[PDB]
Amino acid sequence: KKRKKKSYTTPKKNKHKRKKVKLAVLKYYKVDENGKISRLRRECPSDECGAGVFMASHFDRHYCGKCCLTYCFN
Amino acid sequence: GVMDVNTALQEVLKTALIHDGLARGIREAAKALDKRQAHLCVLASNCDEPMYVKLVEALCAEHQINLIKVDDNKKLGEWVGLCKIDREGKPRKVVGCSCVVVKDYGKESQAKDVIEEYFKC
Ligand SMILES: [Zn+2]
């Protein structure tokens, strides 16, 4: 019946705010001066993860995000 | 009678919209192009970002897909249904790929045919 008074356990956990990125320019690279696009990111080797999807490049490892398939640099 | 490109485009885009297709925005339009599910591309003019338009020409050229260069991207937003709310809202859509044929599986209108007739020459 009393108030929670839960100030002992944390000061309110912040929720996640996704950082806003403008476009997907960094993925493709035409700029060959000869209309030759070069893909700056690997693509996924899964069946439902064809040419459209790509795979992220952290300081190590390659990560998909769609099927969560990971290839460590090593 | 006369069915010039700037009036058959509205018909074909709408008719696709009833039957899916119409990959709006640079994302998922690049996906349709790379996945080779695209049959027509509609890039809008007056796009400030040069890399945007240059990359979409690159994609269309390498994938050997026709490209229409309309102006006033807001009009493209009207045409692809981004407006809604009677005739308010109106977000710009400066690129769109017509998946599953230029037309759609529902109907094959001659307004689709004028597009390929104009693109053949
Ligand atoms: Zn994947």
Domain range annotation of chain B? 5-121
From ligand 1's centre to the CA of B108, what distance in Å?
35
B13/B5 Cα distance (integer angstroms): 12
Those of residues 16-35 in B touching chain A at CB distance below 8 A are 26-28, 30-32, 34-35
B42/B119 Cα distance (integer angstroms): 13
A7/A20 Cα distance (integer angstroms): 32
Elucidated via: cryo-EM
- Nearest Cα residue to B74 out of B65, B83, B84: B83
CATH number of B5-121: 3.30.1330.30
Q: Which residues of chain B lie closer than 8 angstroms to A51, CB-CB? A: 34-36
A52 and B31 within 8 Å at the Cβ level: the answer is: yes
Q: Report resolution (Å) to 1 decimal.
A: 2.6
Instruction: Please check whether residue A30 is in contact with residue B58, taking contact to mean a CB–CB distance below 8 angstroms.
Output: yes
From ligand 1's centre to the CA of B63, what distance in Å?
22
The DSSP bridge pattern shows strands B38-44 and B67-70 to be parallel
